[PDB]
């Protein structure tokens, strides 16, 4: 039933603008892991990236990363389309600055040393609007790519230069920040994490369904266990994770 | 008065010495401040000697400024502190710059009378970090 748009998931690969996806549906598609691709997203936005196969994942999910996640604008439980981009072009001079006040408290041409590395051979491939990240040095930091001399999607190539400038802008109200947490931040718990994520996606993703049958949901849930252990993390991220509003007491 | 003549005090409040006209020794302290750096005094001026000679409010301070030798017995204890507290407060640059925890509770258990409040303020005033008592 027109198997062009795809369900979200969480990604293994940690690396940015790179996915993950089953891998009988690489005809389907017809495209290559290499084949960079174009994803769509709410709002009226669409990235690209590169594309890989696997088998781990369903033949109806997609596997990413909070970033793209956040630039898309999009959460788990949603859907998506996709396009083969064969069109591709090679990313001249196309600017960036560092878009946060994380730039607050540092010194230095830092774009040389997080950046020089983090393009160096990832063929990464780039569009307008990217909110991509890099870290080193106890400290971790984005970048926008604000300019496309090619527009709006092109590739990275070693030599395509980098007059680095520009003062910290501000990240608007749409876009939320790396800081914020999520599941990939915590470990040990993925047992409870998982029944939570089950119990809970439901209310929240489908009220109007709940409404159209008669079930009573959960309204008190209690967690008990030693300090130090990521209870207000793990209610934390699940809020963050979901869009729904959060209070704290 | 003989001493502030052609030379209209160049001065850092708080620079302690000797001046009299007499048995030539007595301190020269900071009481006032109507402009809060230094300056170089001028005849015509007016001046208040309403206050009083005071005890050695300063003297302790500058007993405490001492600090660590002032105090025997706990070579360790007050080895740990000073790695533990010197860093956040001499350079807090260097913490801003990065992303890592200080440390904002410490706890001393021990007998009485075994010279902690002392403790405390020896190492306030080596750092000359303000220091509060309750
Ligand atoms: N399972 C975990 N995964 C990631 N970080 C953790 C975990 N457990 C503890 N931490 C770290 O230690 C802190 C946990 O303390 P906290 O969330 O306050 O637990 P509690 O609320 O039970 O005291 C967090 O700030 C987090 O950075």
Redesign the interface.
Known sequence: NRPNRLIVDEAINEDNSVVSLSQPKMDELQLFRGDTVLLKGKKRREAVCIVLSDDTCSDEKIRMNRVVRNNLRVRLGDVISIQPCPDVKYGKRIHVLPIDDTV???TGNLFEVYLKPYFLEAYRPIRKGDIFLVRG???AVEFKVVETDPSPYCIVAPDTVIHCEGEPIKREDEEESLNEVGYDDIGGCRKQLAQIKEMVELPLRHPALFKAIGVKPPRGILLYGPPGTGKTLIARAVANETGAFFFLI
């Open positions: 607050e408290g540092i040095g106890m400290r």
